[PDB]
Homo-oligomer: A and B are copies of this chain.
Amino acid sequence: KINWEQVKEWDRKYLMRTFSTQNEYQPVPIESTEGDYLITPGGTRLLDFFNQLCCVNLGQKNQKVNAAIKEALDRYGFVWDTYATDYKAKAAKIIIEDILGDEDWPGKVRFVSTGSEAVETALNIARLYTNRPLVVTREHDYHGWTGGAATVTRLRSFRSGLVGENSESFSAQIPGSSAVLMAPSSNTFQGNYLKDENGELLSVKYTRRMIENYGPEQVAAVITEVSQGVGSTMPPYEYVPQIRKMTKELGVLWISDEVLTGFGRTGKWFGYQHYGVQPDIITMGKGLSSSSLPAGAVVVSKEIAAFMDKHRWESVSTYAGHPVAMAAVCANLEVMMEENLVEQAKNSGEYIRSKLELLQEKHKSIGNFDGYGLLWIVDIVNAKTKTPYVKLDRNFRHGMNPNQIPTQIIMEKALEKGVLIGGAMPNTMRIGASLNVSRGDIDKAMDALDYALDYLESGEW
């Protein structure tokens, strides 16, 4: 028996706000979830085409995963990373032996609790292995929020600072803010992508020049997102291979941050696998457990594992390897494999492409779309001017009025159809569902977006 009015009162009074001022905040309670739906206390069913934060890959509240979690709870309990469990060892084995079994670069795994912790771990490993201080990142990359992970995050809207309520006058970034260099993203220098007289993209060419300017001996790693998640982009095809090749030639590591693109999200097990290359280190979260319980991970190459194995590593994280979280990881990955959700993701993405083609034929406010599996971006433009409504685009901050932001207006309208859809960036949709989402829910969501776009293209906002 739940008093949801009291829940709302406690939520307003006792919880720190994010993205909303206390003044403007309206709690949105969710009582339960199932599949691709969120259920409100009043029983409203909301189709979630955010998939929360593109992180509930298996679907909400999967009975096999929950059954597995309950089973672990007959035995545990808690032990820290110094102790071995069946669940922890099995999860590592599934990742190296079963999912990555076709590639021979992967060596070992470290489990932590979050994607930010995974990136922190990867940054530490890369710097220790090379004995070099600098890490290269890209414009608009999001790699997490904790101190180290934030240093490689280049989105001024997502760096844990403060903005005003529909005002430009009360903004601040955190005082004090690094061993980090910002390179151009894949989406710079366009309008197609410019290459030199060698076919090398100008973003990569300049990335190479930056490393050489500092000296390769000063640079541990380039950390990337194969597709920018929060920053909401897709790369030209040759970018990922060219970065892999450039790093190899300069003797610098490449960390593929797969926290979002990992575990079937893009229609392969990992984002990088679309590109015929292999990373030195992968960071993991989100689909690692499909958010059933908090888990993150890093996978390091055999070379890197062999180096770390020769040393005593002075690093403790209390909940790293948590055996109940590991049981949840095991079950999540087993279901993913047995149901062949990767191939299902691939097929559903192809279906989504067709739906978006029709939406673009119909709606001139769709400037561009791209993606794969259950990860899509849709660039929104003024249908008249052919330019984005919000000039600062991906360099915006949240001090703007939401009623001026296209992705906000699309979200509010789509909501009238009982659909959750939109994006983090002001001019770009970021669309994701569970890997096992049904065609009918795809149709429902696309129809809702259709309805929102009519409204956007109508003015009246």
Contact = CB atoms under 8 A, between A and B. Distances in A.
A363 interface: no
A131 B172 contact: yes
Contacts of A101: none
A250 B321 CA distance: 39
Interface in A253-295: 285-286, 290-294
Interface string A43-80: 00000000011011000110000100110011111111
Given A83-B28, A179-B176, A92 B10 contact: yes
B89 A212 contact: no
A88 B132 CA distance: 39
A323 to B, nearest CB: 8
Interface stretch (A139-147, A335-343, A364-372): A139-147
Interface stretch (A305-313, A377-385, A440-448): A305-313
B313 A162 contact: yes
A26 to B, nearest CB: 10
Q: How many copies does the complex hold?
A: 4
Contact of A32 (B76, B96, B398): B76
A135 to B, nearest CB: 8
Contacts of A160: 124, 313-315
A246 interface: no
A293 B309 CA distance: 29
Given A76-B33, A89-B11, A147-B151, A18 B81 contact: yes
Given A53-B80, A171-B217, A89 B399 contact: no
A175 B133 contact: yes
A350 to B, nearest CB: 27
Given A146-B120, A147-B149, A161 B213 contact: no
